[PDB]
């Protein structure tokens, strides 16, 4: 079932009209949305929160521990959400559910789509890339210095041919590199060849 199950109680909602990249249909479920197995969602609006103070608590208590990941996504439409957010976060901590903030119905629909679309997606997107290209590797090696950055590395590889040439360069020669400056060249030279041991 590659579709979102929507609770019948959300018939007159303005957010479920903003999901376009994934299909959805209605169904009798405890949470407002069922984004696959072990994942559910409950929609709240801070307006409905401060006109119905006890509505969300009952839903969160009746939702139960059936779903592993339970997301309480809210719409920040009021102008002063500081007080409501504190109580909502405390309630989420107590009830073991995740709080996600959307500032428009467009964002809530995108969150629903992403939760549905990422049912089996791995975590390789989150982890570091660490490109294996030689330019990328030498840039990463040169970046470890305090002040050397990507553009500095790029102009370093343009001036000196190989890393052997950069090593062979003297302190004054490194300082004379266009756009390097005295302090960055000095600290690179100090890093370039200093005894590994001691301190």
């Amino acid at each position: 079932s590659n579709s979102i199950i929507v609770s019948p109680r959300q018939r007159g909602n303005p957010v479920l009209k903003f999901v376009r990249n994934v299909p959805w249909e209605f169904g009798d479920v405890i949470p407002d949305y069922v984004l696959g197995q072990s994942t559910c969602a409950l929609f709240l609006s801070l307006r409905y929160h401060n006109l119905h103070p006890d509505y969300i608590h009952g839903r969160l208590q009746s939702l139960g521990k059936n779903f592993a990941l339970r997301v309480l996504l809210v719409q920040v439409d009021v102008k002063d959400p500081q007080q409501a957010l504190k109580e909502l976060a405390k309630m989420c901590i107590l009830a073991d559910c995740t709080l996600i903030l959307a500032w428009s119905p467009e964002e809530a629909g995108r969150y629903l789509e992403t939760y549905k679309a990422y049912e089996q997606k791995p975590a390789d997107l989150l982890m570091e890339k660490l490109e294996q290209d030689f330019v990328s590797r030498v840039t990463e090696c040169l970046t470890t210095v305090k002040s050397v950055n990507k553009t500095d590395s790029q102009t370093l590889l343009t001036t000196f041919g190989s890393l052997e040439q950069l090593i062979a360069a003297s302190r004054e020669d490194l300082a004379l590199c266009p756009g390097l400056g005295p302090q960055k060249a000095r600290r690179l030279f100090d890093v370039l060849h200093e005894p590994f041991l001691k301190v």
Binding site: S7, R9, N13, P14, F43, S45
Partner: peptide, 7 residues
């Protein structure tokens, strides 16, 4: 039952 929305 409210759904967290205002008609």
């Amino acid at each position: 039952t409210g759904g967290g929305f205002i008609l």
